Design an enzyme around this catalytic site. Structure first.
Site, short mmCIF file in Angstrom:
data_model
loop_
_atom_site.label_atom_id
_atom_site.label_comp_id
_atom_site.label_asym_id
_atom_site.label_seq_id
_atom_site.Cartn_x
_atom_site.Cartn_y
_atom_site.Cartn_z
N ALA A 227 1.44 16.32 3.59
CA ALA A 227 0.25 15.95 2.83
C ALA A 227 -0.99 15.85 3.70
O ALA A 227 -2.11 15.97 3.19
CB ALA A 227 0.46 14.61 2.10
N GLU A 230 -2.71 20.14 6.61
CA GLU A 230 -3.69 21.18 6.29
C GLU A 230 -4.92 20.63 5.57
O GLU A 230 -6.03 21.13 5.80
CB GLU A 230 -3.04 22.31 5.47
N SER A 232 -6.47 17.70 6.09
CA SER A 232 -7.39 17.15 7.08
C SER A 232 -8.10 18.25 7.86
O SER A 232 -9.31 18.17 8.10
CB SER A 232 -6.64 16.25 8.05
N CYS A 342 -4.77 8.82 -2.55
CA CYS A 342 -4.35 9.30 -1.24
C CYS A 342 -4.03 8.16 -0.28
O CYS A 342 -4.94 7.42 0.11
CB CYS A 342 -5.43 10.19 -0.63
N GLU A 351 -10.38 10.63 10.92
CA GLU A 351 -10.27 11.93 11.57
C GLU A 351 -11.55 12.74 11.46
O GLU A 351 -12.09 13.20 12.47
CB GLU A 351 -9.12 12.72 10.97
C1 HEM Z 1 -9.12 15.08 3.96
C2 HEM Z 1 -7.80 15.11 3.80
C3 HEM Z 1 -7.09 14.74 2.47
C4 HEM Z 1 -7.42 14.96 1.19
C5 HEM Z 1 -8.63 15.75 0.62
C6 HEM Z 1 -6.37 14.34 0.39
C7 HEM Z 1 -6.28 14.34 -0.95
C8 HEM Z 1 -5.34 13.67 -1.70
C9 HEM Z 1 -5.38 13.51 -3.14
C10 HEM Z 1 -6.48 14.08 -4.05
C11 HEM Z 1 -4.31 12.82 -3.52
C12 HEM Z 1 -3.94 12.41 -4.97
C13 HEM Z 1 -3.14 13.52 -5.69
C14 HEM Z 1 -2.73 13.18 -7.13
O1 HEM Z 1 -2.94 12.03 -7.62
O2 HEM Z 1 -2.16 14.08 -7.80
C15 HEM Z 1 -3.55 12.51 -2.31
C16 HEM Z 1 -2.37 11.82 -2.25
C17 HEM Z 1 -1.61 11.59 -1.13
N1 HEM Z 1 -2.02 11.82 0.16
FE1 HEM Z 1 -3.73 12.75 0.68
N2 HEM Z 1 -5.44 13.75 1.22
C18 HEM Z 1 -5.87 13.96 2.52
C19 HEM Z 1 -5.28 13.53 3.69
C20 HEM Z 1 -4.06 12.90 3.78
C21 HEM Z 1 -3.41 12.45 4.98
C22 HEM Z 1 -3.99 12.60 6.43
C23 HEM Z 1 -2.22 11.95 4.59
C24 HEM Z 1 -1.10 11.31 5.40
C25 HEM Z 1 -1.37 10.54 6.46
C26 HEM Z 1 -2.10 12.02 3.15
C27 HEM Z 1 -1.05 11.55 2.40
C28 HEM Z 1 -1.00 11.45 1.02
C29 HEM Z 1 0.13 11.01 0.21
C30 HEM Z 1 1.48 10.52 0.79
C31 HEM Z 1 -0.24 11.08 -1.10
C32 HEM Z 1 0.61 10.70 -2.35
C33 HEM Z 1 0.35 9.22 -2.70
C34 HEM Z 1 1.18 8.70 -3.88
O3 HEM Z 1 1.68 9.55 -4.68
O4 HEM Z 1 1.31 7.45 -4.06
N3 HEM Z 1 -3.24 12.63 2.70
N4 HEM Z 1 -4.22 13.05 -1.23
#
Ligand code: HEM
Length: 395
Positions: A227, A230, A232, A342, A351
């Site tokens: 997650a 790519e 970040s 997220c 970052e």
């Molecule tokens: C700029 C970078 C990132 C963007 C644009 C982003 C975007 C998102 C978005 C939009 C969601 C919600 C998706 C949904 O509700 O269907 C999400 C969930 C999540 N993100 Fe990110 N993310 C980013 C970076 C990261 C990083 C660095 C991590 C891990 C350290 C991460 C881990 C997660 C996880 C585990 C979820 C699922 C949370 C859940 O279902 O409770 N993401 N992300």
């Protein structure tokens, strides 16, 4: 039949394309990348309302059997009543880790990568920021967050790639290998805890005393790499391209680097790398912004059109890194909303802030190699990514 997510104009210009559906109406029938029927929801308020609504869930209406639980068990595929426990355990681990204390380590990785950059130039004297800065930084930060040894960086890079492509002829080998790698790392850290996130995941406790199983901890490790890696990197790439094509913004930040936290909010809104949420599914017939949605219907929330919604933002099409005010609460959906928001957001914001800061200070006269950077824009449904970003470090 309606708009299809692999439609060329949506792939090439989702801003305009989903902005059209947005203005036509809040709910518009269309097709998932599948050809599967979806409801496109595209406006700021309706996107948030759906993401808050417990009537919309993430479960829909060749890999071996014991290994399946490591993919089906990912937190983004989890609904209440299972999701809250999982979310509590991993977020308690993040809280004990102290994500903001990671900033100096992120600077050291970025500085190290930036010092190498001139040695990665091609013959034209240009250098690709994606391959030699954004991607290495993002995977290094994630691996070091978790506690993966440096010597296994490359292995995890490959495993990350294996996880996104999901080719059976590759995964029938590497998936067992990486799962076993993780169980062994868990047993190693259990016998000797450190201060890395794996140790905090092992130590974390729910209020009733419950803990993550080792299978859940392995699944969480895979999920974090997948997650965060790519997404970040392309925040950094997109944001750098956004600043260099708007040179007064680049100039503003080089004069006033204290503006970076506010700037990063606008870069998330304007060029965040994720354009759509995971598919939602109605659990019962319901009325959504005036449209009947049937139980089992799939809804595709469109984050990019919500982040450019003129109902919520003044002149949304402008890039303006002063838009977000000092101390203002987060005001975009580029990280989602509600219980699946997220959980890497704090790490991602740090970052990007650190990457930009060090890039601004180390190459204050950074320039685009001659070209519209958009020539390298991938054609990805719901993602927003550059194949490369060729720069000149110095005049
Ligand atoms: C700029 C970078 C990132 C963007 C644009 C982003 C975007 C998102 C978005 C939009 C969601 C919600 C998706 C949904 O509700 O269907 C999400 C969930 C999540 N993100 Fe990110 N993310 C980013 C970076 C990261 C990083 C660095 C991590 C891990 C350290 C991460 C881990 C997660 C996880 C585990 C979820 C699922 C949370 C859940 O279902 O409770 N993401 N992300």
């Amino acid at each position: 039949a309606g708009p299809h997510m692999m439609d060329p104009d949506l792939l090439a210009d989702p801003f305009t394309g989903y902005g059209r559906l947005r203005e036509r109406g809040p709910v518009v029938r269309g097709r998932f990348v599948d050809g599967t029927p979806v409801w496109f929801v595209t406006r700021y308020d309706d996107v948030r309302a759906v993401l808050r609504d417990p009537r919309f869930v993430n479960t829909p209406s060749n890999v071996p059997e014991p290994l399946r639980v490591y993919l089906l068990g990912s937190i983004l595929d989890s609904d209440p009543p299972d999701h809250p426990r999982l979310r509590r355990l991993v977020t308690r681990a993040f809280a004990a880790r102290r994500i903001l204390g990671l900033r100096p380590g992120i600077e050291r990785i970025a500085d190290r990568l930036l010092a190498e950059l001139p040695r990665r130039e091609e013959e034209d004297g240009t250098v690709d920021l994606l391959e030699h800065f954004a991607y290495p930084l993002s995977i290094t930060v994630i691996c070091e967050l978790v506690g993966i040894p440096a010597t296994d960086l490359e292995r995890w890079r490959e495993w990350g790639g294996d996880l996104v492509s999901m080719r059976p002829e590759r995964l029938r080998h590497s998936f067992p290998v990486m799962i076993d790698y993780c169980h062994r790392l868990i047993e190693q850290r259990r016998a000797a805890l450190t201060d890395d996130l794996l140790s905090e995941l092992i130590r974390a406790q729910d209020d009733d005393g419950g803990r993550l199983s080792d299978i859940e901890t392995v699944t969480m490790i895979l999920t974090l790499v997948l997650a965060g890696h790519e997404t970040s990197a392309h925040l950094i790439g997109n944001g750098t391209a956004a600043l260099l094509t708007h040179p007064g913004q680049w100039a503003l930040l080089r004069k006033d680097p204290a503006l970076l936290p506010r700037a990063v909010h606008e870069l998330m809104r304007w060029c965040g790398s994720v354009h759509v949420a995971r598919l939602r599914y109605a659990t019962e017939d319901l009325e959504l912004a005036g449209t009947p949605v049937a139980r089992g219907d799939a809804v595709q929330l469109v984050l990019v059109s919500a982040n450019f919604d003129p109902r919520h933002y003044s002149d949304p099409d402008r890039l303006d890194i002063t838009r977000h005010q000092e101390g203002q609460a987060e005001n975009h959906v580029g990280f989602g909303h509600g219980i699946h928001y997220c959980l890497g957001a704090t790490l991602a914001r740090q970052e990007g802030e650190v990457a930009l800061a060090r890039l601004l200070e180390t190459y204050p006269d950074l320039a685009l190699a001659d070209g519209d950077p958009e020539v390298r824009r991938a054609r990805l449904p719901g993602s927003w990514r550059l194949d490369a970003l060729r720069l000149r470090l110095r005049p």
